[PDB]
Every structure is written in C-alpha cells, then in structure tokens.
Amino acid sequence: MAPNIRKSHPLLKMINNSLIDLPAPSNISAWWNFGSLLAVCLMTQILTGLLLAMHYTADTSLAFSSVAHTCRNVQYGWLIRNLHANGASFFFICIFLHIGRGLYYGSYLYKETWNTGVILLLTLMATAFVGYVLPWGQMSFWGATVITNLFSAIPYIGHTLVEWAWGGFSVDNPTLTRFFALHFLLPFAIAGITIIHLTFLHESGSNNPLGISSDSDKIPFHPYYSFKDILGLTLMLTPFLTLALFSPNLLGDPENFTPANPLVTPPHIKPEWYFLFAYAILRSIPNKLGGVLALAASVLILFLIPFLHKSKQRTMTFRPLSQTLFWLLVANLLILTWIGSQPVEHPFIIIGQMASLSYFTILLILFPTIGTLENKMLNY
Amino acid sequence: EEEELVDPLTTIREHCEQTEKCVKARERLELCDARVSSRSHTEEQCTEELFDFLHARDHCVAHKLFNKLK
Amino acid sequence: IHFGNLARVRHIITYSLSPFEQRAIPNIFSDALPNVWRRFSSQVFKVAPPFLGAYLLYSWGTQEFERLKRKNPADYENDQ
Amino acid sequence: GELELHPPAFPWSHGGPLSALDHSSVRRGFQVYKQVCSACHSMDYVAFRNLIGVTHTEAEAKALAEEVEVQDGPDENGELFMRPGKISDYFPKPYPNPEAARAANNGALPPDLSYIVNARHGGEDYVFSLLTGYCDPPAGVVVREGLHYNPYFPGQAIGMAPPIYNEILEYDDGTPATMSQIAKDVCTFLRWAAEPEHDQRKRMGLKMLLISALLTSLLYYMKRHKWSVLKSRKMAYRPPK
Amino acid sequence: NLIGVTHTEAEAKALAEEVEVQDGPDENGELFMRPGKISDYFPKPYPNPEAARAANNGALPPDLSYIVNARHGGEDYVFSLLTGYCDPPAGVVVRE
Amino acid sequence: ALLRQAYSALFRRTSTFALTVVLGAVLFERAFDQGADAIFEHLNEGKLWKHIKHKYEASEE
Amino acid sequence: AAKNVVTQFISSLSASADVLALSKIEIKLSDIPEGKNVAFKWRGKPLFV
Ligand code: HEC
Ligand code: HEM
Ligand code: HEM
Ligand SMILES: CO/C=C(/C(=O)OC)c1ccccc1COc1nc2ccc(C)cc2nc1C(F)(F)F
Ligand SMILES: CCCCCCCCO[C@@H]1O[C@H](CO)[C@@H](O)[C@H](O)[C@H]1O
C-alpha cells in the first residue's frame, strides 16, 4: 500500500497526477493559462446548453419562439441564453490565443498533443455552426443554406452529400432536428478528445517560454498554477461578463431577431466574428470549388506547421526575424477578419485576395525560410 | 396668439439650420436642386446633398431635442 | 511519478523565505515599474509596426470605399 | 443607388450602462402603441400581465385586457367563440396572417414590433429618426404611388404613411402630445418590449462589477503571496572547483 | 400509401381527387378548396373531438390508424366486436 | 490588535476559519445587496415603477 | 457569487412566468345563482363552484 491515499487510490491518484503533484515548468507565462480556461469554458458551455435545451423545441414552427419564450418566461432564461451565446465567443477568443501561444513558442513540436488540438478546433467550429442554426432566425437559416450548399461543388458525391445532410431539397425542419442532435452531441466528443489531448501532453510535460529543458526547475502544479489559473480566469471573466451584461447585442447580427424566411435573402450574409477570417478566404477565390478548398486548407494548414519548423531553437523568444513575421501574420488575420465583414466590392475584393495570398505564403514559405536564414546568422 | 402647442423639434430644427455646418450644406443642396430641376435630360439626383444636410441638421438636433421633452 | 527522475543536477544552492516573512508585491517603484517599461520598450518595435501598417490599410480602404459612393460632378456637365 | 443616411445618437435616459428605463415614458409609449401602431403592427410576444408592476397596476392591466375580445374554443359542439380578455392573453393581432396584412397596406407588410429595436441597425435611434423624418424627395427622385419618401429608410421609399402627428392622441398624464414627444415615448416602450430584463440586467451588471473588482484583487494578492517564495528566491553555483 | 400495396398509381390518384381538401391562404389570405392529391391524407370526418361527440351522442369514435395495436386482442378483438352484437342477458339494462 | 485576535480566533483552526467564511458570507450578502440596490435606485430616481407607483396605487378613479 | 449563480440556474427549472400565469383563478361569486352549478377550467381540469 501507499502512505497517502492520494498516490494509491485509482481515482484520487488521477486527480493528483494531473492537477496537484504534476511537475510544471517554473516559468510558464500567462499564455499558458488558456488551456485551463478552455476547459472551464467547455464545462460552462455544456452546463448552460443543457439548461437551454430543457426549454427548446427543435421544430421550424417553434424554434424561434421557444428561444423567445426562454428569454421572456424562464426564470433567468435571458441570462442563461446570454452566457451561452457569449460563452461561445469567449471560447474562441481563448482558443485563438491558445493556438497563437503554441505557434510562437513551438509547442507544436509535441505533435500528438498538437494534432489533437487541431481536431478540437474543428469539432468546436462544427459545434458552433450547428448551434447557430437553432434559434432559427434569418442569419441562422441563410448561414446554414449558403455554407452547406458549398458541398454540392464537390465532384459527383457532392450534389448528393448535400441533400443527404439536409434530409431534403433545402434547409428545412429535417435539417433543424438533426442539427439539434449534433449540437447536443459534439460537445461531449470535445470533452472526450480533450482528455486525449491532456494525456499526450502529460507524456512530455509543458513546454516553456525559453524553449529549454525545465527539468532543472519543475514545480508542483498546486498551489503555483492552480492559483495562477484561477486568477487568469477572473481576469478574463470580467470583460466577458462586462460585455455580456452591459452590451448583450454587441457581437450579434440583428438580422437574427427576424424569423427565418426562405423567400427573402438578407443583403449581407456574414458569420460571427470568429469565422470572418475564414469567410474572407472563402470569398477570395471566385469559383465555388476552389473557394471551398481554400477554406478547407485555411484550417487544415495547422496540421502542417510541425513539419515546417527549420529553426534550431524551439521558440521565437530569441528569433527577432521570426517574431516580426509572426506579428505580421497576426495582423494579417485582423485584416482577413475585417475583410470578412465587408461586402464583395472594390477595394475589399483585392485587399482580400492579397491577405489570403499572404496568409498561406507566410506559413508555407517565409516561416520555414527565415528559420533557415536565422540558423546561418548564428553560424549553425 | 396667446397659448398654442408647438413641436420643440421644429423650433430646434430651425435654430439648428443656422449652423455654419448646415448653412454650407443647405446651400449646396439648393444649388443641385436648381440645376437638376432645370434640365430635361439628367440622371443626377440630389440625394447625396440632401443627406449631408440632413446629417448635419439632425446631428445638431440630437444634442438639444431631448432636453425639451418629458 | 515525474519528480525524482527529471535531471542530473550538481552543486547548486538555492535560498527562499516563507511567504509570511516577505512582501507579496515589493519594490513597485524601484523595480517593478522600471522592468515593466524595460519589457514594453523592447517589444514595441516588433509588435506595433505591423498593427500600425494594418490600421493604415484599414483606414485607407474604408475611406476609398466611401469615396466611390460620392458622385463625380463631371458626369452632369454636358446635361443642359 | 447605394446611398444610405445614418441616424444620429439621441441621449436616451436608458443609455447609461447603469441607467434604467424611465417607466413613465414606457407607460406613455404603450398608449401610443395601443392607440396608434397596434392598428397595423402586432406585438406577439408581449402580454397584458407583462405591464403589471412595470408600467401599470394589476387593476389597470386587467381592464386593458378586458377591452379586447379573444377567440377561444372549441366548446361542447366543437365551436369557436368569443370571450373577454384576461391578463394572460397576448396583445391582439391586427390581421389573421401576412397575406391579409399586405392586402390592407398595399402589398406592404407591417412587421411585428416585439423585437424591432434589436432587429434594425440603429435601434431606437433608427426608429425615432424614421418616425420623425418624413419629407419630400430631392430633385431627380420619384417615389412610386402608394409609397412615401423617407431618407432614413433604405431605398427611401417606405410603405408606411407618417403614423404620427401632433396631438394625434392625448396622454392621460397630461404631457404635451407633440409629434417628437410621442415618437420618443413609443421608442422607449419598444426598447422595453424587446428586452423586459433591461433594468434587472443592469442592476446585475453593477453587482457583477463590484464583486469582480473585489475578487480579482484578493486573488491577485493570494497569487503573489504564494509565488513570493519563487520571485525572491536566490541561487548560486558552488563547484568543488 | 395505397400505391404498390393495394392500388395502382392511376387508381390512387383518382381516389384522392374524389375528395376536396382545404388549402390556403391565397393572395387575400383566404382559405379555399381544391381537389385532392396522392400526397394528402385520408379526410377527417369531424373538425375536432367536440364535434365528433356531438354527432354520436357524446361518444367519440377513435382514429383507426393504430387501432389493432391499441386494443388487447388486435384484429381478433375488432372482428369479434363487429360481428358480436346481440341482446343483453337477463338483469342487464343498456342506457338509451 | 485585530489581526492578531482575528488570527487566533478565526483563522487558526480550519474549523473556525470555515465557520467564519459562512457567517462572513451571510453578513456580506445582506449588506452588499442593500447597498447595491440602494446605489442603483438612487442613480435612477423617479424612473422605476417603485417611484411612480403612488400615482395609480389607490390614488385613482 | 456561487450561491447566486447556483440559485439563478436552479430557478430556471421551476415554473416559468407563463405557467405561473395560469396558477390561480379568481371567480366572481356575485354571478352564480342558487343551486345552479358552474364549471370553470382551472389547470386544464374542471373546477366546480
Ligand atoms: C398601418 C396603417 C400603420 C400604422 C398605423 C403604423 N405603421 Fe409602421 N408600418 C406600417 C407598414 C405598412 C410598414 C411597412 C414598411 C415597408 O415598406 O416595409 C411599417 C413599418 C414600420 C417600421 C419599420 C420597417 C423597417 O424598418 O423595415 C417600424 C419601426 C414601424 N412601422 C413603426 C411604427 C410605429 C412605432 C407606429 C406607431 C407610432 C407605426 N409603425 C404605425 C404601417 C403602419
Ligand atoms: C477544446 C480545446 C482545447 C482544450 C480544452 C485545450 C486544453 C489544453 C490544456 C489544459 C493545456 C495545458 C495548459 C496550457 O498550456 O494551456 C493544453 C496544452 C496544449 N494545447 Fe490545448 N487545448 C485545446 C485546444 C488546442 C488547440 C486547438 C491546439 C492547437 C491546434 C492545442 C494545442 C496545445 C498544445 C500544443 C499544448 C502544449 C502547450 C505547451 O506546453 O507548450 N490545444 N491544451
Ligand atoms: C462546445 C460547446 C458549445 C458551443 C460552442 C455552443 C455554441 C452555441 C451557439 C453559437 C449557439 C447559438 C447562440 C445564439 O443564439 O446566438 C448555441 C445555441 C444553443 N446551444 Fe449551444 N453550444 C455548446 C454546447 C451546447 C450544449 C452541450 C447544449 C445542449 C446540452 C447546447 C444547447 C444549445 C441550445 C438549446 C441552443 C439554442 C438556444 C439559443 O440560441 O440560445 N449547446 N450554442
Ligand atoms: C449555420 O451557419 C452558421 C454561421 C455561424 O457564424 O456560426 C457561428 C454562419 C453564418 C453566416 C455565414 C457563414 C456561417 C458559417 O461560416 C463558416 N462555418 C464554418 C464551420 C466549420 C468550419 C470547419 C469552417 C467554417 N467556415 C465558415 C466560413 F465563414 F468560412 F464560411
Ligand atoms: C464574478 C462573479 C460575479 C457574481 C455576481 C453575483 C451577483 C448577481 O446577483 C443577482 O442580482 C439580481 C439583481 O439584484 C437578483 O435579482 C438575483 O437574484 C441575484 O442573484
């Protein structure tokens, strides 16, 4: 047997070996706080989602009103609804920084942890996609219509997969009910895979800002990082709540306060902020199929980063050239975001094609190149 | 009145049209209107000019109007 | 079990004080802030540049787009 | 033809992050709606009971609801039938369905007003600017018969004839029923109908902030206190050199 | 549903045209009649149960879609009932 | 010396520490709520139903 | 913080405002003659007064 029941117990040993005695680098910065936030966020989305699902009705004649009934009649239903929709945003803000950090500090060298990370991203994106359709407003319907319609651009198997996915000839009730089911389901898969994510991670342990072995200076996750993570939570949570409670409709499209109508196409069909950059890249390539492929790759490109690392150093902490290139990339993304919210007209169309072009260029050409160049400047 | 009911909006609307911003905008409209009204063939319209005026007048009205409403 | 198999280390001494003997946030002005500035300074020129270059692009394109809405009086001169 | 005029920013009494809705203005707005808009505009999501404790008395609200006839049924013979209203009933619909609505408005469809301020960019500023912004079309612009010129409405030709003019009604609280006053009130009322939680939401936001400040502070100390052991730590390399 | 089971496609379309179905609304927002299509369901005898009872002495003839599975006995029960009407034994009085 | 007293009576034994947190919460709630509503309402004098309520509460018809 | 948030969510599960609206019924006794009985719908089922 073992003296303390935290080491021997098949369950308390688990809570312990991953949240209490777990060896963590003594110097990980606040950019290492997002993993826990992502987790907490996930548990939060699930809780508020269940609460909402208990008053929802997956039917085209009742969806829009069931949500209105929830906000108007359910005790604190409005608050739960606010937290859920805005929670999805927080979720993405957190996930984008999580990724950024990983790109900057070369965490992707932990390939399995990284590849499962990508799968989590995709699952989260599909989840928000189906979830967005549920209130059944105008943007819910046209977003669903426009996007799922891209698959018919695939060869042969296309025109089919679409009418199979819709369960009919157009986005209609059968599509709605199957979307509720998927939205209710995917989050659990996310939780599932998140477990796998943390398992692979624990093999190696966390990376750290200098990118050098932290074996000479490890510290117990608790109280160091439990306190640091809890603080990081409250710090983020304040703006989340502030924006949520004081400017509820800041992020939302007003076109969604109008019940879906198949006979009235909205003037400007655009996604929530977190999908804008991808929308921009989608529209950058005029040709239904090539635009689809460009969108696909805009995210699937993440599976390649691990292979385009040429530097002899792990992070960018000591690589000034890569740093600016990195911030160029970040700024490249605000631009695509902005473009994604603008109509398809000059000068936006060309600015858009450029930003897309630069996006893939920076990741596939410049980064690997500058890394090589940098090794020679260190005489390596 | 001796005792009549007036829309504080129309009052404030008048007082605002006296802004240098409005006067200047108002003038360019009257000019467009004039040349457009006096032509049998012309796609020109004074929307843009109307808008700049309305934009300046109404901007001014906003800062004053509610002060005189319950 | 990851504590004990980590690394081969020799001849390093470290000294630390209980948290109840020291100040939680010490030397705010003599040390804290000076470094905050140090850090800010060293990064500004790597970060700021591209963000600024984006603000411009944004600002231009936003205006250039509005300009194309205004009319060109040189299309209604031959209208008498 | 891609020109649009944007409404200004009026200083509503409920614009501050901590500023509630002026319930006297909301009460009046209701009258405007009840006595003017409701003749063409439905407000399917609000019920008479919703007025209770907000703008009206329970007695008042029950009366307002009895002023309306509601179709109930079936009965014993499977027949529909009329009955006086109850506070549990929702505001009455002007027409049976959109088709009938358009028929009575020249093919135009007056939208439900329940979520109007959140369904239009501009909110109450847009609705206010539109109600009080009717005027004559500039040179070169012709509005098709049946439509009216309004610069604030996209396309500028709106199917709604100016709904309000001075003294078109009288407030029983004795407020000068000038046109702008009326629009101001109905807009305040429209904000409430789109989001009844408005006030509670802000009262909470306030508490959320204080607790948020207090907690973030305390946790910052705690974090620093624990980390102090490492922050001040010193070390040396002492080889047997 | 009759097509390919008990009837022809032609036969089925006919059967459906022998019925008037209420569609609508139209331009003026009016309901209106129209001949039946094979996509229509078997017509209801009454608008609602209340009307049904009224026409059967307060009795309500149930929908027959799931009748055989909704009664212990199934087709044996329905058959035995249809062909089992008779006079009450001594001591038993059936209300009018 | 409250810090000293507080430490010996409240923060010493984990048992009294938790008991302190509870009564602390109980008292803090009651107080934080009143003060919060008081601030909120004061900031909105005459706009709430609470305020204009007298005009129709047994003072009409 | 916890106590309130938990309270708020737990409340979400109890009767909504619309359901509560049909909770009680107030009948006018000054409209019911002797002997004659009257039935009012109360909570879906009949109510005899
Ligand atoms: C029926 C004769 C009406 C009365 C009385 C009022 N409104 Fe109306 N409204 C009406 C129509 C037919 C339309 C259609 C406009 C179109 O061409 O689509 C409307 C529309 C509105 C709108 C804005 C519609 C939009 O922005 O797309 C609003 C906000 C609106 N009406 C408000 C409103 C108010 C507040 C009124 C009472 C003061 C009111 N309307 C009366 C017809 C009629
Ligand atoms: C459901 C979403 C996700 C959750 C719950 C999650 C959770 C975690 C957690 C808790 C950590 C450890 C602490 C930290 O460093 O932040 C972690 C680390 C990591 N995650 Fe994620 N993650 C998510 C998505 C992703 C994504 C999208 C990527 C990248 C495509 C990713 C890449 C990584 C990597 C590489 C690490 C290593 C960090 C390091 O030590 O350098 N994760 N993640
Ligand atoms: C990874 C977690 C999840 C994400 C990213 C997420 C995201 C979303 C999004 C973006 C919407 C639309 C919000 C809006 O109205 O604008 C939504 C709505 C909804 N979600 Fe989720 N959700 C998640 C988990 C869940 C879960 C677990 C459930 C069910 C148990 C759930 C139930 C619902 C319901 C009922 C709606 C419709 C009502 C509404 O629109 O608010 N969600 N979700
Ligand atoms: C049902 O549609 C939901 C949309 C949404 O924003 O969800 C939050 C939405 C609304 C309007 C227009 C487009 C969308 C969805 O857009 C996307 N949705 C995506 C969903 C999953 C993945 C992997 C990529 C996606 N890319 C996009 C892209 F923006 F690029 F078009
Ligand atoms: C960071 C966590 C902040 C939590 C703040 C909890 C404050 C919410 O408190 C809420 O205030 C409302 C208005 O008075 C009341 O009606 C609710 O019943 C009450 O729970």
Side-chain angles (χ1 to χ4, degrees), chain A residues 122 125-126 128-129 132-133 139-140 143-144 147 269-272 274-275 278-279 282 295:
Chain A
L122 297 175
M125 280 164 91
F129 178 76
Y132 194 68
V133 176
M139 203 49 76
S140 304
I147 298 306
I269 290 180
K270 60 181 208 68
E272 287 281 30
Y274 48 81
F275 277 132
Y279 197 37
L282 170 68
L295 168 56

Side-chain angles (χ1 to χ4, degrees), chain C residues 9-13, chain D residues 236-240:
Chain C
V9 170
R10 311 190 52 186
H11 316 129
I12 297 187
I13 308 186
Chain D
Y237 175 52
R238 288 223 162 201

Side-chain angles (χ1 to χ4, degrees), chain E residues 5-84:
Chain E
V5 180
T6 61
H7 291 62
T8 280
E9 177 146 60
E11 277 179 350
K13 183 182 171 177
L15 280 168
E17 297 180 300
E18 284 176 40
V19 188
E20 282 294 291
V21 282
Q22 179 175 68
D23 213 4
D26 56 48
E27 318 71 71
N28 323 310
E30 297 291 21
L31 288 169
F32 69 87
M33 295 315 106
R34 71 180 182 69
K37 322 168 175 183
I38 59 182
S39 54
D40 285 313
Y41 291 67
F42 295 166
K44 293 191 177 71
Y46 318 94
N48 51 69
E50 287 71 35
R53 290 180 183 296
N56 288 285
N57 300 295
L60 172 58
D63 180 82
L64 297 186
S65 300
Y66 290 97
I67 199 53
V68 297
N69 293 316
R71 292 294 187 295
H72 284 101
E75 44 272 62
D76 280 351
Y77 168 76
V78 176
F79 189 83
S80 294
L81 177 88
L82 287 185
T83 66

Side-chain angles (χ1 to χ4, degrees), chain D residues 13 18-24 27 53-57 60 199 203 206-207 210-211, chain F residues 28 32-33 36-37 39-41 43-44 46-50 52-53 55-57 60:
Chain D
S13 66
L18 298 183
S19 45
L21 279 176
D22 168 14
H23 289 198
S24 292
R27 184 195 173 88
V54 177
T55 63
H56 292 62
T57 276
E60 276 177 350
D199 294 12
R203 190 195 252 69
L206 171 62
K207 295 183 181 181
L210 296 187
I211 291 300
Chain F
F28 175 81
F32 181 80
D33 289 323
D37 302 315
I39 297 178
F40 186 72
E41 311 197 16
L43 286 162
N44 289 284
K47 316 167 68 178
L48 314 184
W49 171 252
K50 170 179 185 170
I52 72 173
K53 180 184 57 176
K55 306 179 176 178
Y56 330 83
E57 213 61 330
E60 194 171 63

Side-chain angles (χ1 to χ4, degrees), chain A residues 76 237 241, chain D residues 200 203-204 207-208 211-212 215, chain F residues 32-33 37, chain G residues 1-2 4-5 7-8:
Chain A
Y76 295 109
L237 214 62
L241 298 186
Chain D
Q200 173 178 48
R203 190 195 252 69
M204 284 182 45
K207 295 183 181 181
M208 171 285 274
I211 291 300
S212 192
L215 204 28
Chain F
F32 181 80
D33 289 323
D37 302 315
Chain G
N4 287 301
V5 170
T7 290
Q8 290 165 182

